[PDB]
Amino acid sequence: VQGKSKATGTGLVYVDAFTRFHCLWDASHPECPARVSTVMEMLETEGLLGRCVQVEARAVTEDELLLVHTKEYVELMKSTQNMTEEELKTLAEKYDSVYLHPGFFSSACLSVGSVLQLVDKVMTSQLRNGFSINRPPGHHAQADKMNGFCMFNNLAIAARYAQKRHRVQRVLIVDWDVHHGQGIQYIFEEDPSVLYFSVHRYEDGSFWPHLKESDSSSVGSGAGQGYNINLPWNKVGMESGDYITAFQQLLLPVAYEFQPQLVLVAAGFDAVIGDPKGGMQVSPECFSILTHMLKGVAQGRLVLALEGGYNLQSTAEGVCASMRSLLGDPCPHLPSSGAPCESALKSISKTISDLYPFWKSLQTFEGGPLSEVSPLPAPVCAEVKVSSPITGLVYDQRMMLHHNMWDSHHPELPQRISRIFSRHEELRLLSRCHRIPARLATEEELALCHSSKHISIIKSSEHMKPRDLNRLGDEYNSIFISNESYTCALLAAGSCFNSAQAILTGQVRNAVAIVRPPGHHAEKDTACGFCFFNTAALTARYAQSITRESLRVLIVDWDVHHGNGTQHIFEEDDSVLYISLHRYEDGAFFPNSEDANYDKVGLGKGRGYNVNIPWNGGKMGDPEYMAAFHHLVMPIAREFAPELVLVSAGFDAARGDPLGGFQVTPEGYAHLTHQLMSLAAGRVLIILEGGYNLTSISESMSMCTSMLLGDSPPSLDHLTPLKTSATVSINNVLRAHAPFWSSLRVNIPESLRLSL
Ligand SMILES: CCCCN(Cc1ccc(C(=O)NO)cc1)C(=O)Nc1ccccc1
Ligand SMILES: [Cl-]
Ligand SMILES: [Cl-]
Ligand SMILES: [K+]
Ligand SMILES: [K+]
Ligand SMILES: [K+]
Ligand SMILES: [K+]
Ligand SMILES: [K+]
Ligand SMILES: [Zn+2]
C-alpha cells in the first residue's frame, strides 16, 4: 500500500577498531586483523560495499553485557586495558584457546555494539537486513569466561537485547561456523524463547573444543528442552549438498514451526573450501543459498555477524556470497552436486531422531527404512554471471477473446487475467517489472509436444460455426471452444516462450506469465480440462531448443489438479523433472486417473524423474503445502539441479476457490515462490494454469511476483499441525522416491511409537 516507506537495504558495520588488536606472543595466530581488512578489500573489489547502507558502530554498555555475562567477569575483562604483556599472558593462559591485548576490550565492546546497531535498524523497519564485519568473534564466550578467541558473546547479547529493547518474543540463532558455539548453547540451555541451531565439525569429540555437549543428544534442559539443536559432522570434507539437505529436512521445518521474529546468524566461514581449520569443502556460492533460505523464516528480519573463517580468501569469498543474498541479487548455480553424502545423512537423521519428541514439524516422518541404493546422477550447472535482477512480466488483453457462448457461468472466465493484471498495477508491481511482448507460438513450435492431428483440429476451429464448436467441444472431457480459442492458446504458449528466451539470454532473471487458456491437462493428441496446448511442456522444449537438447528443466505444478498432460509428455524424459501437488482423493478428483499417485515415478529412462504428491481426505493448506516443499519438492529439485524452473501456477488450490476446496493463503504461495528462487540461479518462470476465484487469484499471483522482485517473504499462520491424511501422503512419496534421490533418505527408527 506504501513503497517509499518499505524497508529495503542492507546495513554494514565496520570500524578500524576491529584491526587495533592481535596476538603479541604469536605473529602467526589465525585470529588476526587481516581477516576483516581482506573482507573489506573484496567487498569493494566486487562492488558490494557501495551497495550497503553504512551503519555506525557503538560500544556495548555494562548493563547490555550483564544480560548474559557476570559483573565479576565484565570487570576483570575491563581491567585488561591497563595490563603488561606478561599480566595479559598469565590471564589468557587461564582459558581454552585465547589470547589478550591492551586494545582487546575496546574492540570486543564495539564488536557487540555493532550487532545491536543492526538489530536496531532491522527491528525498527529502517533496513531489511544487515551484516557486521566484526572481530573478536562471540559464539564461544560464556557468562564468566573467555573461550575459542571470543571475549563477549555478541549474538547471545543481541538475542536478549532484541527481547528486552524491541520486545521480541522468539529469536532463532543459526551457527553455520564450523565450530560448535558452546558459549551460546549454555546461555540459552533453559530459555525456550531462544531456539539455537549449530551445524559443526565433531568427529565424536575428536575436533575442538572436544565437548560431549556438542552432540545431538544435548537438546537443552528444563523449560528450554528441545530449543538447542546440534548437527555434528563425524567425517570431514562436507560439501554444499550436506548443508542444503540439512537445512531442508531439519532446520527449515523446525524454524517455520518455531516462528521467530528475528534471525541471528553466527556467520563463520571456516567450512568454506581452503579453510585450514575446518577441513570442509563447501563452495562460497552455497552461503548465497543458505542466507536466502533464512530470509523466509522471520520475514526478512536477518542479521549476520562474522565469527570464524581463518583463510583470508575463503572468508572474504564467503562473506561476499552471503552479502549478495542480503542485497537481493539472484542465487548462483550450485558449483557442486545437490546430493548429500552418507555421513551427512547419518548425522542429519540422528539429530532429527534426537529432536523428534519436541517438534511437531519433525513428527512428519513415520520412521523405519528408506532405500540406500546407488541414486540418480546429481549434475552441476555451468556458472551464470551474477547480475542486477530483472523480473519480466507478460500479459496481452487478446487472451480474453476465448469464451463459452453457452454456459456464461463457466469458471475459466476472460476476467481472470485482466483482474490479476489490475492488482499487479494497483500494487505497482507492474511498473517495477520489465514488460516482455506476447507472441504467437508457431505450428513447428506446437509440434515440439503435440500431434499434427491435434494441431490441425484446434487450428481449424478458427473458422468453425458455433454448432460445430459446441459439437467439437463435447468430443473432449471439460472443453469449450470459440472462434478465438486457437489464437489465445497460441499467445498463451508464444508469450511463455518469449519469457523463457528473455530469462535464458539474461535479458531478465525471472518472469511471470498472466496467460489463458491453461495447459497442464492438454496431451500430445487431445485437449482436456480447459487446456488446448501444454504451455508449460512446450516452453520446456522451446528452452531445450534455444539452448541444448540436454537442458535440465524442472516443472513444479502447484495447481490443485494433477497435470496428466505434463506427466505423460515427459514420463520417459530424464532431462525434464515433473513435480505435482494435487488433490487425488484416491482417484475421485479430476482427471480421475490413478496416474496422479505416488507409486507413479516415471517410466523407462525417466524412472525417478516424475514426482506426485497426492492429497487424500482433508482441506489441505499452507501447513501441508510447505512441509511438502521442505521434505520433498526442494530436496528432489536441488539433487536434479535444473537450469530453468517452470511453475504450473494454479491458484485453484487457494482458500476461496470454488473448485479446489483447499485453504492455501496468498502468503503461502509467496513462500512457495520464495523457496523455488534458490534453484536454477533464480531462473524461475511463473505460468498461470488454474485458479477460479478472481479475488483469490489476483492476490495469490501478485504475492508470487512480489517474491520474484525480491520483496521480503510475508507473515504466515500456524504451519504445525498438519492433516494426518497428509503426513501419510508425504511419507509415501519419500519411500517411493528414496531409491532415486539421496536428499530424501532420513533413516530414523520408531520414535513415532511414542506420545499421543
Ligand atoms: C468431470 C469434470 C469435473 C471437473 N471440472 C472440469 C475441470 C477441468 C480443469 C480444471 C482446472 O483446474 N484446469 O486448470 C478444473 C475443473 C469441473 O467441475 N468443471 C466445471 C465446468 C463448468 C462449471 C462448473 C465446473
Ligand atoms: Cl574421542
Ligand atoms: Cl508419522
Ligand atoms: K557451528
Ligand atoms: K534454548
Ligand atoms: K570459529
Ligand atoms: K498439481
Ligand atoms: K521425467
Ligand atoms: Zn486446476
Output the number of helix runs. 22
Shape: elongated
The CATH topology assignment of the largest domain is: Arginase, Chain A
Helix content bin: 25-40%
Q: What oligomeric state do these chains adopt?
A: monomer
Note the beta-strand portion.
5-15%
Give the structural class: alpha/beta
CATH class call of the largest domain:
Alpha Beta
- The count of domains is 2
Global Rg: 27 Å
> What is the CATH homology-level superfamily of the largest domain?
Histone deacetylase domain
- Major sheet: arrangement of strands: 2-1-3-8-7-4-5-6
Question: Termini separation (Å)?
Answer: 45 Å
| Number of E-type strands | 16
Bound molecules: nexturastat A, chloride ion, potassium ion, zinc ion
CATH architecture descriptor of the largest domain = 3-Layer(aba) Sandwich
Verbal overview:
Its main location: other. Pathway: Protein modification; protein ubiquitination. The protein is of the alpha/beta class. The protein folds into two domains: 1-376, 3-Layer(aba) Sandwich (Arginase, Chain A), CATH 3.40.800; 377-756, Histone deacetylase domain (Arginase, Chain A). The chain has helices at 34-45, 62-65, 71-79, 85-93, 104-123, 154-165, 182-187, 240-258, 285-296, 312-326, 342-355, 415-426, 443-447, 452-460, 466-474, 485-504, 535-546, 564-569, 622-640, 666-676, 694-708, 724-737; strands at 10-13, 53-54, 129-132, 171-175, 194-201, 228-233, 262-267, 302-306, 391-394, 434-435, 510-513, 553-557, 576-583, 610-615, 644-649, 684-688. The chain has an eight-stranded parallel sheet, with helices on both faces. An eight-stranded parallel sheet has the order 10-9-11-16-15-12-13-14, with helices on both faces. Helix 5 (104-123) crosses helix 6, helix 8 (240-258) packs parallel to helix 11 and helix 8 runs antiparallel to helix 19. The longest helix is centred in the first third of the chain and has 20 residues, at 104-123. The protein is elongated and about 100 Å long. It starts with 9 loop residues before the first strand and ends in a 19-residue tail after the last helix. Bound molecules: nexturastat A, chloride ion (CL) (2 copies), potassium ion (5 copies) and zinc ion. One potassium ion (K) binds at residues 177, 179, 268, 270, 307-308. Residues 410-411, 478, 518, 521, 529-530, 559, 561, 590, 650, 652, 659, 689-690 line the site of nexturastat A.
